[PDB]
């Protein structure tokens, strides 16, 4: 049977939400042996993404992500790093630990590929310096990027009010204002953490914002993709 | 730093949810790298626990259970298995893969002495059957047993409802009914599914009932417990 490994804790309460939206995207009809087998690391002692980017240490969090793709390997047949600026870290990992990875950038970019709208990177100053979105996505060209400014104000929603486990719909006005300034319905979580907003949007029936979001992606075609 | 290991998928939608609870009760001062650190084998595929003692075949069952807590041994520091019933398995287990491990049981005795007024034992025919509340607890004198027949309520309101993610809420009325008829105003969890009523009350805030419940214990008391 195909097992799922994550690599995640970063951060823990977005990856336990994940694991949530696994099995709620995938319901079983009688039994629960129908469901989704799943391997979730949750490490939140990995370094900070962003912070070891703005400090020297980028080694440090590339072993954490190298020892981790090693211990996956072993034991599943598909596997999900639960955060996009931790992708940084890919190109120093040999490609033999990389086979079996799904990356959030290119779920994204599949999504917005069928979308085909100019659409919101939310991040993540982190993600924004390495530009793995711009770097990533052969739909680059429909990425609308935030200002240095607003980049700064992102990450204060994501650490303040997402990672400390705080309503997602708190940020929502901040968010629609957002939207409304680039000119646009749609946003990319370019933070895992926007997995979060986009659950409460979708649990509040609120349809009028796109969410191109890698994990409810992943959790809704969990079937199709785990192999 | 210390790593729980969690044996679960029994069911998947409680696993989610510990793992969440894990997170809500452990919220970090400034940085995520404070907080617990969790490996979750999420397996559904795991055979019905009550399913392999109304059946032959429990070897099957101990073989799943004593091959996963090889691999935990060797990654997690404790070790919890998300279901209670499936504490059945633990006396044909080799006591070395054992030393690890957190009983659900146990922690249930624990709380139980402390709370020291009868409770409702809210379980599963194949908890019952197996004894594990009745032989394992040193407050077993507290525990009121369940009829039979409502034995099997609360195993339609476990599969029927909790294990397939519907509202914890809407069996609320049955299960006061219940705590009435036998005369007090708390229950333990005799099956993990019942963290899911848990997490409804103290959401609700909803005190009238005292809730035993281990995954709830192991959770806040996380710091404590995991060495
Ligand atoms: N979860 C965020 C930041 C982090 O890795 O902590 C991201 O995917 O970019
Ligand atoms: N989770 C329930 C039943 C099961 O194992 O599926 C229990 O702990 O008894």
Same mark, same amino acid.
């Given at each position: 049977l195909p097992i799922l490994g994550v690599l995640g804790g970063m951060g823990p309460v977005v990856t336990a939400e994940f694991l949530k939206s696994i099995y709620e995207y995938n $319901?079983?009809?009688?039994? &629960?042996?129908?469901s989704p087998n799943v391997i979730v690391f %949750?490490?939140?002692?990995? $370094?900070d993404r962003t912070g070891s980017i703005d400090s020297g240490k980028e080694r440090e969090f590339i072993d954490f992500i190298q020892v981790n793709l090693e211990h996956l390997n072993k034991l599943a047949d598909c596997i999900v790093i639960? %955060?996009?600026?931790?992708?940084?870290?890919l190109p120093q990992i040999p490609e033999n630990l990389k086979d079996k990875l799904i990356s959030l950038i290119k779920i994204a970019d599949q999504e917005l590929q069928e979308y085909n709208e100019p659409t919101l990177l939310l991040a993540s100053t982190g993600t924004y310096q390495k530009k793995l979105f711009q770097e990533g996505?052969?739909?680059?060209?429909?990425i609308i990027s935030l200002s240095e400014s607003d980049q700064k104000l992102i990450h204060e929603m994501i650490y303040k009010v997402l990672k400390r486990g705080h309503? $997602?719909? %708190?940020?929502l006005r901040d968010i629609e204002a957002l939207l409304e300034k680039y000119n646009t319905r749609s946003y990319i979580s370019? %933070?895992? &953490?926007?997995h979060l907003l986009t659950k409460s949007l979708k649990l509040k029936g609120i349809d009028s914002i796109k969410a191109i979001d890698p994990l409810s992606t992943i959790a809704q075609n969990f079937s199709q993709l785990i192999i």
């Amino acid at each position: 049977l195909p097992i799922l490994g994550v690599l995640g804790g970063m951060g823990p309460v977005v990856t336990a939400e994940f694991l949530k939206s696994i099995y709620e995207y995938n $319901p079983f009809i009688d039994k &629960e042996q129908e469901s989704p087998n799943v391997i979730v690391f %949750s490490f939140p002692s990995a $370094p900070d993404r962003t912070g070891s980017i703005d400090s020297g240490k980028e080694r440090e969090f590339i072993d954490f992500i190298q020892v981790n793709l090693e211990h996956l390997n072993k034991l599943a047949d598909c596997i999900v790093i639960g %955060s996009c600026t931790a992708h940084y870290a890919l190109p120093q990992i040999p490609e033999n630990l990389k086979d079996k990875l799904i990356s959030l950038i290119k779920i994204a970019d599949q999504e917005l590929q069928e979308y085909n709208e100019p659409t919101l990177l939310l991040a993540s100053t982190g993600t924004y310096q390495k530009k793995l979105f711009q770097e990533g996505c052969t739909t680059a060209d429909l990425i609308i990027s935030l200002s240095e400014s607003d980049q700064k104000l992102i990450h204060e929603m994501i650490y303040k009010v997402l990672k400390r486990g705080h309503d $997602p719909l %708190s940020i929502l006005r901040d968010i629609e204002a957002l939207l409304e300034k680039y000119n646009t319905r749609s946003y990319i979580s370019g %933070s895992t &953490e926007f997995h979060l907003l986009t659950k409460s949007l979708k649990l509040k029936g609120i349809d009028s914002i796109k969410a191109i979001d890698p994990l409810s992606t992943i959790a809704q075609n969990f079937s199709q993709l785990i192999i």
